[PDB]
Structure 1
Amino acid sequence: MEMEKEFEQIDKSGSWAAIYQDIRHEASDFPSRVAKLPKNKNRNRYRDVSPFDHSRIKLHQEDNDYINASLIKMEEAQRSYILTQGPLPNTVGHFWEMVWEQKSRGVVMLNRVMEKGSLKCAQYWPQKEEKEMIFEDTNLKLTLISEDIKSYYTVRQLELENLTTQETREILHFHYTTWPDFGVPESPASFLNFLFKVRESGSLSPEHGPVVVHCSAGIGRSGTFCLADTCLLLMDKRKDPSSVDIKKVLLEMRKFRMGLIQTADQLRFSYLAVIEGAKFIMGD
């Protein structure tokens, strides 16, 4: 079925939970043996969210190459994404090592450091220009260059230096700051505006390594971001945009990381975002 009228048909019939459970039942199951090794326990935030072995990002290190991060490669859309958990106190150096080694231009953050009165990820970037961060375990230096605070999101320019080689690179930090502590946003307008700002920066384009996108677990809000982006790109590429099937795209992405889209409300929100976004691109 088309999307916008499949949407109204699920609303009127109140069957979002059943649609979402079908996706959970059909989703891929692949091994994650490296994630579960005892030496990696303090490298995982949640015991039930792990990268698959076949798609995990490897650190360029011989001691321990493990990080909780997955490469999502979308062949028809010609886009790739790295989805990862929010960094832990003992993985902030690994996080920036991955950004460096994978040649990423942008980092997309969809959570606040504290939500619901608890810590959802480490403070992993510097908050003042004159107070830079040094990660001694991976030999990197990170400096805040500029910060632009807007009503729904903040963009930061960062400098990452590989202290072994003295090479430097400019990284863009795109921080969506207004996702509610509970539920999903009422309108997708600010989330779509944010997606378009990431696109306009070059951070999603083939002349760079994959964008790094995270929330707390790296599957829920993060899944919504890449699902919406890929569906909108496919609608632009194809002769028949109504042939894009958001459930099929989501199942394809779940071949590369488990659990993408965590609730039926997130699924409904993803439909809403793609529907509204397709009108602004031109459509209607």
Structure 2
Amino acid sequence: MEMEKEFEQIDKSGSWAAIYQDIRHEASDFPCRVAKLPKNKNRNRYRDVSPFDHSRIKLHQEDNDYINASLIKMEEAQRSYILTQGPLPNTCGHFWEMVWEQKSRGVVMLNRVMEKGSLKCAQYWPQKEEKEMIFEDTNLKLTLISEDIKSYYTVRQLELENLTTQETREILHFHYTNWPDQTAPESPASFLNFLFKVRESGSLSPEHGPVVVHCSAGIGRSGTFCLADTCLLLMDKRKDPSSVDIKKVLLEMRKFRMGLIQTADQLRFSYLAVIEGAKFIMGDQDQWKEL
């Protein structure tokens, strides 16, 4: 693969930090005026991570429509993702409102609630079947239906009810619990197995709304998730799978959300995940589950 042999050329040349920062200099810049309004300051987890006005998810509440979330619309791949920050104590009803209004079927969570001794994310879903959550501001009810806790991830079925209309949807919650606290994983095998469990679930199907993906800021690990999924898709449909330039895909995603892929190490890991993932989607997954 030209991806694989450019990978080695970067590894032998030790120039990941340079490749990465070229990406940072070429990345798009668009205005974020709504994110920056004083009335929205307490709706943002980091003052330096904001959604572009042009691609932001608008809540359909009449008062304040703001939420720190971005629609990543990948035209050629024919896949959309919503990348958002980890909910704040005060934005958990906003988060489920978005899930409801965008008709999402899956929520992908790439961080632990606590990491490096701090809260990266509010406890926004119920932990016991018998103690559901009611979000009074957005009039939503969230019930844990089942958990399947595995080694490196946990899948949850949740029931989201619109208390106004009383419809209910099943939401699948995919929680990658194994990402180290200060580095990308040593092997992409665990991560690729997680991506493919999300794929198999149907939460990425075009019949549903965009999957909601978040980590703490919603740009780093979230960026890795969508970037590797989209490259594997394009490899699957392009007739010339060798032609997928992961850096040109990243810059296209960065038209929709700033800062996707936070470190040169994450960039290196995304290469690995795509390279390793291409080996399944071109002829040969059973050995990822093993390790």
TM-score range, shorter chain: over 0.9
Q: Deviations over 1:82-116 (max 9, x none)?
A: 00000000000000000000000000000000000
* In 2: Cα distance, 1:52 partner to 1:282 partner: 36
Equivalent residue, structure 2, for 1:124: 124
Q: Deviations over 1:133-160 (max 9, x none)?
A: 0000000000000000000100000000
* In 1: Cα distance, 2:276 partner to 2:8 partner: 14
Moved over 2 A (4+): none
1:173 aligns with 2:173: yes
SS in 2 for 1:34: helix
Q: How far is the alpha carbon of 1:2 from its aligned partner? A: 1.4
SS in 2 for 1:58: coil
Q: How far is the alpha carbon of 1:31 from its aligned partner? A: 0.2
CA RMSD after TM alignment: 0.7
Q: Deviations over 1:6-62 (max 9, x none)?
A: 000000010000000100000000000000000001100000000000000000011
* In 2: Cα distance, 1:222 partner to 1:136 partner: 28
Q: Deviations over 1:150-182 (max 9, x none)?
A: 001000000000000111110000000010011
SS in 2 for 1:194: helix
* In 2: Cα distance, 1:62 partner to 1:130 partner: 32
Equivalent residue, structure 2, for 1:148: 148
SS in 2 for 1:276: helix
SS in 2 for 1:4: helix
SS in 2 for 1:159: strand
Q: How far is the alpha carbon of 1:282 from its aligned partner? A: 2.7
Q: How far is the alpha carbon of 1:119 from its aligned partner? A: 0.4
* In 2: Cα distance, 1:249 partner to 1:58 partner: 25
SS in 2 for 1:20: helix
Q: How far is the alpha carbon of 1:239 from its aligned partner? A: 1.0
* In 1: Cα distance, 2:113 partner to 2:26 partner: 33
SS in 2 for 1:57: coil
1:275 aligns with 2:270: no
SS in 2 for 1:35: helix
* In 2: Cα distance, 1:237 partner to 1:264 partner: 28
TM-score (normalizing by structure 2): 0.96
SS in 2 for 1:131: coil
SS in 1 for 2:247: helix
* In 1: Cα distance, 2:62 partner to 2:184 partner: 41
Select between 273-282 and 122-131 the one with higher mean Cα deviation.
Answer: 273-282
* In 2: Cα distance, 1:68 partner to 1:244 partner: 30
* In 1: Cα distance, 2:165 partner to 2:277 partner: 43
* In 2: Cα distance, 1:271 partner to 1:282 partner: 16
* In 1: Cα distance, 2:239 partner to 2:124 partner: 43
* In 2: Cα distance, 1:170 partner to 1:49 partner: 30
SS in 1 for 2:34: coil
Equivalent residue, structure 2, for 1:243: 243
SS in 2 for 1:143: strand
* In 2: Cα distance, 1:126 partner to 1:110 partner: 17
* In 1: Cα distance, 2:186 partner to 2:166 partner: 46
* In 1: Cα distance, 2:21 partner to 2:204 partner: 31
* In 2: Cα distance, 1:62 partner to 1:8 partner: 52
Note the residue ranges of structure 1 that are not aligned, 5 or more in a row.
none
SS in 2 for 1:142: strand
SS in 2 for 1:181: coil
* In 2: Cα distance, 1:239 partner to 1:68 partner: 37
Q: Across the two proteins, how many residue pairs are aligned to each other?
A: 283
